[PDB]
Amino acid sequence: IVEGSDAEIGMSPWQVMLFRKSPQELLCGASLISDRWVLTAAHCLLYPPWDKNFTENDLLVRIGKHSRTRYERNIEKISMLEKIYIHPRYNWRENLDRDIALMKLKKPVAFSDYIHPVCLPDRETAASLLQAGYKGRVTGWGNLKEGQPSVLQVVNLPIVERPVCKDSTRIRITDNMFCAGYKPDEGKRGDACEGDSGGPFVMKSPFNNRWYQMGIVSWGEGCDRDGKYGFYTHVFRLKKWIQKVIDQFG
Template identity: 25%
Template sequence: SGAGAVPGAWPGLASIQDPRRAGSGHVCGGTLVTPAWVLTAARCFLRARNVSTWRVVLGASDLSDPGPEAQVRQVRRLREHRELDVALLELERPVECSDFVQLGCVAEGRPGGLGPCYIAGWGSIAGTAQAPREVLQEAPVRLLEPEFCDSGGEAVASPQVCAEHSRGGTQTCQGDSGGPLVCREPGSEQFWIVGVTSWGRGCVFTPTWHFSDWVLLQL
């Protein structure tokens, strides 16, 4: 299972919330890619009636007690990719970067080699349908090709990839669509966003190198 993340360890991670939902209202994860735009999954908005009432929380680890470092913004607009499970949210106004709120770096090409990879979010790290957790969880994972995915019977086709806990057992996707898959560049402290969580028991991701050009065109 996942472990509680140290506050500030994931400064680019966003909680996308619907205020009509109980508790914190957490629906999906996302990643801050500019001070005014958050990258997430399009499936998060399949049943959304009025996205302008939704909010995005950045800089928080515990959604029940975000703390003074957290920044909250309403959503100005939603842009969805026509073919892939990817979306961008424009915030009503830019956030201010700090130790707890920072931009994520999107990998534009398929990396030649990757170091350790990680997932994080407030969803059910164990892959069950239980309610999202209030405290941010993280876990190390390893990447899999589509033919090795355990996706609960749903077909996984290229360009999507999967991940599994590097020690077995952890799967993010329930309640955490839209969150990032990040990997460290070998021999460096640089982390790259290499995927956006889509769906499935086996944690299916849409690789960033299939839509990075689209992201740049929207910003």
């Protein structure tokens, strides 16, 4: 996260770290959506241009974390993966269309002050809140500029009008994406960066005072560049697939 700040303790208790077993290293962010299911970006697991194609046994998830590098004894919980599910129409060839994946844990995780699931949006919450100018919150342990944080970083960013997102890039934008970030004339800054992939873009509903995950950190051109924006997977647009997977494999 570029131009963010240290998270408060328990500020993002759905935050998940995807961790490689050997060598032991951070791979991506992710989010906890129930006691058995973790949501991430498909490109965190499958990206052939970079020779990336992980299997369940390659990976761990670390839940309840704050420090990036420490083993947070008595706080974090480490879980093994039962199965990975990648969206069948994930487009890694062109523009990361439908950049979404689910991971089912081998055993349910116990909730605590530091571990708690985020909500997924309904159609009405998405229609109300996915509006240009409305801000969400992005969290992760990725790089601080286009270098690395001691603890989880957080930045609040406004959703951007779709024509502005389109006009910022030569990449083809789809309805399964939205973009967020400040404009050059807005003064303020901030973006996701390498290592924040797969983490959540959340919004706090003013109707029921609950946090909803509206986006997944997907792609950008650099980090925090003027006139560029970060692009996020549109979770609600892909929720029917989420539900199908959970209803049939859970």
